[PDB]
């Protein structure tokens, strides 16, 4: 297990498993030839199942969300090493959205609604949107009710068809879904965009040999292929460290997030 013939490679389920698996097929191939190893992709049922797999050393690489990374890191020996970069920027934003037809175009209009959230351990579809609503005088459980719909796709669709009159999701996923014709820009209004969040970290199991780790780090950081990178809307991968995610630790402490809800 310090240098196995097969690498288990886990991907956070931020969208439908089918989409996540298809988008990563280019990378799967590249890594297979770069390493001379069998590559198995895993897409779990939710973010917490992925944290528990990290915890029991079942993963070798793991593409986490920022909050899910901070959670897994506390109970696992994984370590960060790369993140997507695009026109010099290594960050993304959370979007607050509203149902256009019902006139939900401002924070005041969220009062008395169902507000759509993603997975409970999501950075841009749970943590950041709840903080943002609170900073505009709306407290969950008294001014509105949240509902956990599991993924960012599901949040976007719920707001568009009015099952929820507002919600919170990652801005790159919203942009992607409009490009594909899934989300109609006339039906969903962007009410706000948060400050920058650090990108999703690629991580690796810590008990892998020094030589393999450097090879993994190099391969990602040196990567330049359009087959691999085009489904990601990225120019490459840039280096990152654990302290890039202290902002996220601060935000989670402030909201009152509970590691025991997500692990054990």
Author numbering: 9 to 272
Study text:
Here we elucidate the molecular basis of high-affinity phosphite and hypophosphite acquisition by determining the ligand-binding affinity and structure of the PBPs of phosphite and hypophosphite ABC transporters from environmental microorganisms. We over-produced and purified PBPs of three putative phosphite transporters; PtxB from the globally important marine diazotroph Trichodesmium erythraeum IMS101 (Te_PtxB), PhnD from the oceanic picocyanobacteria Prochlorococcus marinus MIT9301 (Pm_PhnD)35 and PtxB from the soil bacterium Pseudomonas stutzeri WM88 (Ps_PtxB), as well as a PBP from a putative hypophosphite transporter, HtxB, also from P. stutzeri WM88 (HtxB)18. The structures reveal that ligand specificity, measured here by thermophoresis, arises from a combination of steric considerations and the interaction between a ligand P-H hydrogen atom and an aromatic π system in the binding pocket. The structures of two distinct types of phosphite-binding protein and a hypophosphite-binding protein reveal that a P-H…π interaction ensures high-affinity binding of specific ligands, representing a universal mechanism in these PBPs for recognising ligands with a P-H bond.
To try to explain this, we determined the structure of the Pm_PtxB/phosphite complex, which shows that Pm_PtxB has the same overall fold as Te_PtxB, with complete conservation of the amino acids that coordinate the ligand, including the P-H…π interaction with Y206. We calculated the volume of the binding pocket in Pm_PtxB and found that it is 23–29% larger than those of the phosphite-specific PBPs. Comparison of the Pm_PtxB binding pocket with that of Te_PtxB (RMSD cα: 0.75 Å) and Pm_PhnD (RMSD cα: 1.52 Å) shows that this expansion is due to Ile20, which is conserved in Pm_PhnD (Ile11) and a leucine (Leu20) in Te_PtxB, as it adopts a different rotamer that forms a small hydrophobic cavity next to the capping tyrosine that is absent in the other proteins. This seems to be due to several sequence changes in the second shell of amino acids within lobe 1 that create space for the Ile to rotate. We were unable to measure the dissociation constant of Pm_PtxB for P-ligands here as the protein showed evidence of aggregation in the MST assay. Thus, from the structural similarities with Te_PtxB we can speculate that Pm_PtxB is most likely specific for phosphite, however, due to the extra space in the binding pocket could also bind simple phosphonates, in agreement with the previously reported ITC binding data. The unknown substrate of the Prochlorococcus PhnYZ system, encoded downstream of the ptxABCD genes, may also be a ligand of Pm_PtxB. Therefore, some Prochlorococcus ecotypes appear to have two independent phosphite transporter systems, and may also be able to take up some simple phosphonate species.
